[PDB]
Design a protein around this ligand. Structure first.
Ligand code: UQ
Ligand code: 970
Ligand code: SF4
Ligand code: SF4
Lengths: 29, 115, 208, 48, 125, 112, 176, 97, 386, 171
């Protein structure tokens, strides 16, 4: 009478995944 | 009546004049093809091949079929002139690697199971 | 009926039926039939002489404006008098819809080229010429597109054999790639798979 | 093995210098690995 | 704008088929017989066009079945007999046509199994 | 006022109201030469009269675009030109006539 | 919902103008790219030391074919010909007959590895788990005729790779 | 990565970001190559009763296409194939790149 | 007279087997004539001799850069003709692997486009990520690229018990790789002079020439099939459609990079919202039963036999099913006569129309510009030639 | 003679020495060269011929030419300047001895010298290619496929009908 074991996300969810462009300032005047 | 639609020709006279102009074009083009493709055949051989190719379809009496054959011949000539074809495509018209398949009854009886 | 059956949308069904009403009404001269399939796809069967008018209407009318030509293909049905069935699939971005226009022809009757209506057809018709042998009148450049140079025949016809009539190999004597009658080490094995019991009674035909 | 390496370099084999009949000091290939160590080496399992 | 062609339709020159596969081939137009291993009759509805069997030999390597007939796997499906005949005629193939066979209607009766005087009575049930 | 319509090759049309009025009036004029019982004539006059009234009744460009549902009025002008061209082609083609020919007996019968 | 990729304009203040002029005349973005390439140089490469190191694989990996046996040594194949029927590439040739003890067994089982597409449909169709695609992929040959497998070659492949094939099936059969 | 701190600072300055936070190579943060067995739940139609196939037969619900004025067989407001498409919105998340 | 030149097929910049016959006045292109069919294998005629399951691997080989997408399109068409529905978990897996496939395809396209121009390094940088994604493919299916995972009833097998975590670990580091690629290319002035105002096509010309995908969105046309005609759980994910302004190579490059970012977004959402349940339609007359049931149940064995020998019969009818593949609208016109074999299967690939429009797009440009245009059209000849 | 022969290529390669040394100007020697494909077809037909068991065949070409005319035609096909000079037998034998010394394939040898300057025999009592169903191919139809490789760029596209075949001393 075992329970269902299946590939699922963990309780709650996964951590945030960064996707926006990130090009730092990295410059002088 | 049969209620049929033309492609280019109304009767066999227009089809025949189209055939004649295509033959003129091929006859003119053969020497240039021989020089460009560096063929080992003669110009007379190539013109005989052109004549034989034209004569294979001498039995057609439908102007529509004749028009379609002329269209296909124009496409072949365009491929040859633009050098889209290679030497292999030009030389496939002569069948120089195929052994002569016999025609009479006894040879067919001697070689294989089929007529 | 819920989990494993595809849901039905009747709003789109009614909309497509009404537009078929509209198209068949505007063009009685060419439209021969209008159909809507149960998965919400609209088909219009027209006389061949109306390839250029109907398409132009579907491209240029304000209520239609099907401004994209998704595909243009042919189907071979050897049992029909008109052997080849020509299919146009059009997409309307303004109304987010798709339409299908089908006509017919045989081996000797040409069809007006729709390159003027749709510039995308230029290659498509060439493929139909290459694969099926359907000639298109008034084409800017009609020639073979997919087969080899000097290839005889139109392979997509049902009577054309699967493996063709010739095969290529390199010959060392003539020092070139040559073509010879096809021979196979192992013949393609034909399987008779059709079951002797019908599956779908809804498509049963009259008992002849 | 060396678990401090990144995935791909964490397991490896040094081949023998003499297989069935030939000298394999310089001539080595991946077909010399027996099936059990083959399963271990290609990370199909975590157990040798 | 019509031209009113007269003679029989012939597209043999436009098909790319070698001559030996037109003048020497014989096609059969028929309705396939029911497979007696089964009772279903769904495969006896359409007409079929097939070609005559050619030579098959065995490969020197691996002993597979080699062929040289390009039309050995070609079967065409038609609605009526005259459609197939027209297709064969316009493609330049000689044909043999076998007329359709149907099982004649039979008079069945369950009561005949228990006849009072006829031979129809069954020994066992 | 507006800059960069956003579609490449479609320039901003300054003062589109009178351009749309001209286009719709030309479409109506060319439809006047089509037989009255033709479905194309009645349908196209209906929709173009609706559009012309909408154009006349709104001076603002943004509100006119919202009501017309035609997608960024420069495209509405393009569609008006397309409709005028189609009307001329329809006048030459005359497809309100009855069906030119019926198909063969079993041309559209599927399967087989 | 949509966004614009290239629909921005630069500022016109003299500070931004001088910044752009310095970028043009001193090549700052080229130096940034040079910097990026330089960063990679000090990083550890992703190269593995093949053949002494091997790429990661999975139990589901399908490579060279093999015919298996029962623990007693009897061949699992019962000549049902489902693998031949399902084969997309028609790469399986099977001939069968009754054995000396009446067992249903094959006399010919050939797989053309130059015809095969390694889709694994044959091991899904098999009802007795006789034909499998093993873990091996390093079986390149020097002649075309060496890639035409017969029943002896496939049985030898099974006998050679059974230890690992059984372990892979043990870790996978609960997903099938 | 086993790189020294000086080299790490050099790479971080050259690229302008922090590299050790996100490393291309997978070291030990990955899943185990040996996993426990699954259970794989069954589908909805695994009932013992009230499960006749005729009530869940998708293929037999297909019909031949409906015929809308076959040719062989009142103002009438005009229609479009579908309602006009609604205009798109400009990405409250990030409208400009 | 102009000089006639053969570009390909044995050319690094020909992207495979393409014979571009060009007439040149100097290095200025006067006409491009694309000769194709050097990879024409007769896929459609071959499909006409297979069952619906047997014909599935052909679609993997059609666009060998985006495989699960072709599988999904064919499966959607066959499902529509069968009047069946995939389970929700199957649909979520399909969308997840479609987005992974989109990432693979965009990496391939951008890196080889830059390779043609002369930027050789981002190719190496991003093919490591491509290798990790092939590891995902192999783990779920057993093949690195030709998975045959997506079936016309769902998917073949369930995800292994550690795949989602590994996909998550991959997904939280890919934005940095995109950022490094953008640092190399986006603001480089050489890249801009190579790509800006090259191959500009107007929106109306793009519509009439049959373009789709980025080729449309580079011109500013707001069209995306996943947003306008959703075909899966795509109507439950949130993302933005990148839209260009100038219709040139640079705008399309920016659009593809932003589509990679949005694919990362969709992948995150799919990882969060994966539901439980079965993976294929619970109808054994379409999808095979589980091997245990096949080995213990009579009906399961009969259905396994008949599915793997003959296959399911599809009701007669014709459909045109299209999806938003990474290269554009990928479609199939499928005609079924009621048997277990397709009667006709026409495959519509965006590359066909794009390559037909290459000659229009190359007007008034140089040889290097034509190389850039070929790169930016994102052409793979497996689908153009079929 | 053929593409890989040491008969046409041998004579064509002597252009590298400026002049062509011919013993007695090549006027005392008669040659009857045969095509390679003819020889191969004859061997095949002899394999398949049931009555060719203990027979001896002589495969010869259809035309006989003097060595001078043959070499002149060879140089005319390759469009190379023909500058022949007579060399005494002893001196040209000495040249062959000098060339024999090489540890590789010799350019010429004394035996090659003797075989080149010797007339082809006439054997009218032996069967030939016609007895095997083979019609001999004359040199004039297959010389271009061998000697086009020995042309410069300017003459590389000249046709076969441009050489005016040489004189044949037949009967
Ligand atoms: C097809 O087979 C053959 C070969 O194989 C490919 C050969 O190499 C070969 C001989 C190699 C020659 C073709 C090379 C000849 C090179 C020259 C004659 C060198 C002589 C020129 C001088 C040394 C240079 C200075 C000028 C002098 C006057 C001093 C022959 C004959 C041949 O027949
Ligand atoms: C040179 C290194 C960095 C890489 C790049 C590369 C190879 C080997 C081969 C090729 C290649 O790139 C070129 C250009 O891009 C594609 C794209 C293709 O598919 C889209 C494709 O399929 C045939 C072929 C190609 C070329 C193909 O010759 O190694
Ligand atoms: S893997 Fe696929 S192609 Fe290869 S033998 Fe098995 S079923 Fe046939
Ligand atoms: S390998 Fe399996 S499927 Fe193939 S014949 Fe043997 S038992 Fe049947």
């Amino acid at each position: 009478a075992s329970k269902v074991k299946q590939d699922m996300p963990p309780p709650g969810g996964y951590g945030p995944i960064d996707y926006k462009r990130n090009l730092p300032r990295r410059g002088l005047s | 009546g049969t209620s049929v639609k033309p492609i280019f020709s109304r009767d066999m006279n227009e089809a025949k004049r189209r055939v004649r102009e295509l033959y003129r074009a091929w006859y003119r083009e053969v020497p240039n093809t021989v020089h460009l493709f560096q063929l080992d055949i003669s110009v007379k051989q190539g013109r005989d091949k052109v004549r034989e190719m034209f004569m294979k379809n001498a039995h057609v009496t439908d102007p529509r079929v004749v028009d379609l054959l002329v269209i296909k011949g124009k496409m072949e000539l365009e491929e040859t002139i633009n050098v889209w074809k290679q030497r292999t495509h030009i030389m496939r018209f002569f069948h120089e690697t195929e052994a002569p398949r016999p025609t009479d009854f006894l040879s067919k009886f001697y070689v294989g199971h089929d007529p | 009926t819920r989990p494993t059956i595809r849901p039905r949308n009747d709003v789109v069904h009614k909309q497509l039926s009404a537009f078929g009403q509209y198209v068949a009404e505007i063009l009685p001269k060419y439209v021969q039939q209008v159909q809507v399939s149960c998965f919400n796809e609209l088909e219009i069967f027209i006389h061949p002489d109306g390839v250029i008018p109907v398409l132009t209407f579907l491209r240029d009318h304000t209520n239609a404006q099907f401004k994209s030509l998704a595909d243009l293909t042919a189907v071979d049905v050897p049992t029909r008098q008109n052997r080849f069935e020509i299919v146009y699939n059009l997409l309307s971005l303004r109304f987010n819809s798709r339409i299908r226009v089908k006509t017919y022809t045989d081996e000797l009757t040409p069809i007006e080229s729709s390159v003027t209506v749709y510039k995308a057809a230029n290659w498509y018709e060439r493929e139909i010429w290459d694969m099926f042998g359907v000639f298109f009148a008034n084409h800017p450049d009609l020639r073979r597109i997919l087969t080899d140079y000097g290839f005889e025949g139109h392979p997509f016809r049902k009577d054309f054999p699967l493996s063709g009539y010739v095969e290529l190999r390199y010959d060392d004597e003539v020092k070139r790639v040559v073509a010879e009658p096809v021979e196979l080490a192992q013949e393609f094995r034909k399987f008779d798979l059709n079951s002797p019991w019908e599956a779908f009674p809804a498509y049963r035909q009259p008992p002849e | 093995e060396d678990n401090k390496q990144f995935f791909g370099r964490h397991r490896w084999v040094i081949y023998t210098t003499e297989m069935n009949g030939r000298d394999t000091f310089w001539d080595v290939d991946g077909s010399m690995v027996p099936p059990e160590w083959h399963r271990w080496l290609h990370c199909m399992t975590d157990d040798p | 704008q019509l031209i009113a062609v007269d003679e029989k339709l012939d597209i043999t020159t436009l098909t790319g088929v070698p001559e030996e596969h037109i003048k020497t081939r014989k096609v059969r137009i028929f309705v396939p017989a029911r497979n007696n291993m089964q009772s279903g009759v769904n495969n006896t509805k359409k007409w079929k066009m097939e070609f005559d069997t050619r030579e098959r030999w065995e490969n020197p390597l691996m002993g597979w079945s080699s062929t040289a007939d390009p039309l050995s796997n070609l079967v065409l499906t038609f609605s009526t007999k005259e459609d197939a005949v027209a297709f064969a005629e316009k493609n330049g193939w000689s044909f043999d046509v076998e007329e359709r066979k149907v099982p004649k209607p039979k008079s069945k009766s369950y009561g005949a199994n228990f006849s009072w005087n006829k031979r129809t009575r069954v020994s066992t049930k | 006022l507006k800059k960069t319509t956003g579609l490449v090759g479609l320039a901003v049309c300054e003062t589109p109201h009178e351009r749309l009025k001209i286009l719709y009036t030309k479409i109506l004029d060319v439809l006047g030469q089509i037989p009255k019982n033709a479905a194309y004539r009645k349908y196209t006059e209906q929709i173009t009269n609706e559009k012309l009234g909408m154009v006349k009744a709104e001076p603002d460009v943004k509100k006119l675009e919202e009501q017309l549902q035609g997608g960024q009025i420069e495209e509405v002008i393009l569609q008006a030109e397309n409709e005028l061209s189609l009307a001329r082609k329809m006048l030459r083609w005359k497809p309100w006539e009855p069906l030119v020919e019926e198909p063969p007996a079993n041309q559209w019968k599927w399967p087989i | 919902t949509y966004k614009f990729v290239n629909m921005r304009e630069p500022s016109m203040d003299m500070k931004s103008v001088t910044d752009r002029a310095a970028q043009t005349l001193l090549w700052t973005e080229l130096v940034r790219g040079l910097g990026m390439t330089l960063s990679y140089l000090f990083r550890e490469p992703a190269t593995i030391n093949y053949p002494f190191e091997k790429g990661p694989l999975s139990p589901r990996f399908r490579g060279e074919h093999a015919l298996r046996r029962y623990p007693s040594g009897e061949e699992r194949c019962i000549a049902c010909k489902l693998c031949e029927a399902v084969c997309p590439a028609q790469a399986i040739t099977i001939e069968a007959e009754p054995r000396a003890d009446g067992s249903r067994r094959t006399t010919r089982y050939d797989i053309d590895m130059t015809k095969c597409i390694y889709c694994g449909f044959c091991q899904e169709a098999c009802p007795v788990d006789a034909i499998v695609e093993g873990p091996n992929f390093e079986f390149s040959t020097e002649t075309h005729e060496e890639l035409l497998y017969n029943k002896e070659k496939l049985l030898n492949n099974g006998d050679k790779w059974e230890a690992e094939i059984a372990a892979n099936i043990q870790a996978d059969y609960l997903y099938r | 990565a086993s790189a020294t701190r000086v080299i790490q600072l050099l790479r971080n300055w050259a690229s302008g970001r922090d590299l050790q936070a996100k490393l291309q190579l997978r070291y030990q943060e990955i899943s185990k190559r040996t996993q426990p067995p699954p259970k794989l739940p069954v589908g909805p139609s695994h009932k013992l009763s009230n499960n006749y196939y005729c009530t869940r037969d998708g293929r037999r619900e297909a019909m031949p296409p409906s015929i809308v004025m076959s040719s062989q067989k009142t103002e009438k407001k005009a229609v479009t194939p579908a309602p006009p498409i609604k205009r798109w919105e400009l990405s409250k998340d990030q409208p400009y790149l | 007279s102009n000089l006639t030149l053969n570009f390909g097929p044995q050319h690094p910049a020909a992207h495979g087997v393409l014979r571009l016959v060009m007439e040149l006045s100097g290095e200025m292109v006067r006409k491009c004539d694309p000769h194709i069919g050097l990879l024409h294998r007769g896929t459609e005629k071959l499909i006409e001799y297979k069952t619906y399951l047997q014909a599935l691997p052909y679609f993997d080989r059609l666009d060998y850069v985006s495989m699960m997408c072709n599988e999904q399109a064919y499966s959607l068409a066959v499902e529509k003709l069968l009047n069946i529905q995939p389970p929700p978990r199957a649909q979520w897996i399909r969308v997840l692997f479609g987005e992974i496939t989109r990432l693979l395809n965009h990496i391939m396209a951008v890196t080889t486009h830059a390779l043609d121009i002369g930027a050789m390094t981002p190719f190496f940088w991003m093919f490591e990520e491509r290798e990790k994604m092939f590891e995902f493919y192999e783990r779920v299916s057993g093949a690195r690229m030709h998975a045959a995972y997506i079936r016309p009833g769902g998917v073949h097998q369930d995800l292994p018990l550690g795949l989602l975590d590994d996909i998550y670990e991959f997904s939280k580091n890919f934005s940095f790789r995109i950022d490094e690629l953008e640092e190399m290319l986006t603001n480089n002035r050489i890249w801009r002079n190579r790509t800006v105002d090259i191959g500009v096509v107007t929106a109306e010309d793009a519509l009439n020439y049959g373009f789709s995908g980025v080729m449309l969105r580079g011109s500013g046309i707001q069209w995306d099939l996943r947003k306008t005609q959703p075909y899966d759980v795509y109507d439950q994910v949130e993302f933005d459609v990148p839209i260009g302004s100038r219709g040139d190579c640079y705008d399309r490059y920016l659009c593809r990079v932003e589509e990679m970012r949005q694919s990362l977004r969709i992948i995150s959402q799919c990882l969060n919202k994966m539901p439980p349940g079965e993976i294929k339609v619970d109808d054994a007359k379409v999808s095979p039963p589980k091997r245990a049931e096949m080995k213990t149940s009579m009906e399961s064995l009969i259905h396994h036999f008949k599915l793997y020998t003959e296959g399911y019969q599809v009701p007669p009818g014709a459909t045109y099913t299209a999806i938003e593949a990474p290269k554009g609208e990928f479609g199939v016109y499928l005609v079924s006569d009621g048997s277990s074999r397709p009667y006709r299967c026409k495959i519509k690939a965006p590359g066909f129309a794009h390559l037909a429009g290459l000659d229009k797009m190359s007007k008034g440009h140089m040889l290097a510009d034509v190389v850039a245009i070929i790169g930016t059209q994102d052409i793979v000849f497996g689908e153009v030639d079929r | 003679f053929g593409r890989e022969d040491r008969f046409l290529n041998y004579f064509a390669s002597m252009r590298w020495f400026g002049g062509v040394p011919l013993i007695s100007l090549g006027k005392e020697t008669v040659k009857q060269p045969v095509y390679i494909v003819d020889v191969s077809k004859g061997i095949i037909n002899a394999i398949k011929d049931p009555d060719a068991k203990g027979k001896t065949f002589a495969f010869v070409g259809p035309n006989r030419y003097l060595l001078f005319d043959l070499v002149q035609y060879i140089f005319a096909v390759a469009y190379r300047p023909f500058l022949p000079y007579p060399l005494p037998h002893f001196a040209y034998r000495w040249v062959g001895r000098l060339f024999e010394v090489s540890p590789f394939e010799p350019w010429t040898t004394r035996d090659k010298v003797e075989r080149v300057h010797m007339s082809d025999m006439t054997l009218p009592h032996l069967p030939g290619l016609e007895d095997l169903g083979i019609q001999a191919t004359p040199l004039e139809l297959k010389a271009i496929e061998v000697l086009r490789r020995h042309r410069t760029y300017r003459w590389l596209t000249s046709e076969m009908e441009d050489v005016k075949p040489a004189k044949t001393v037949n009967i």
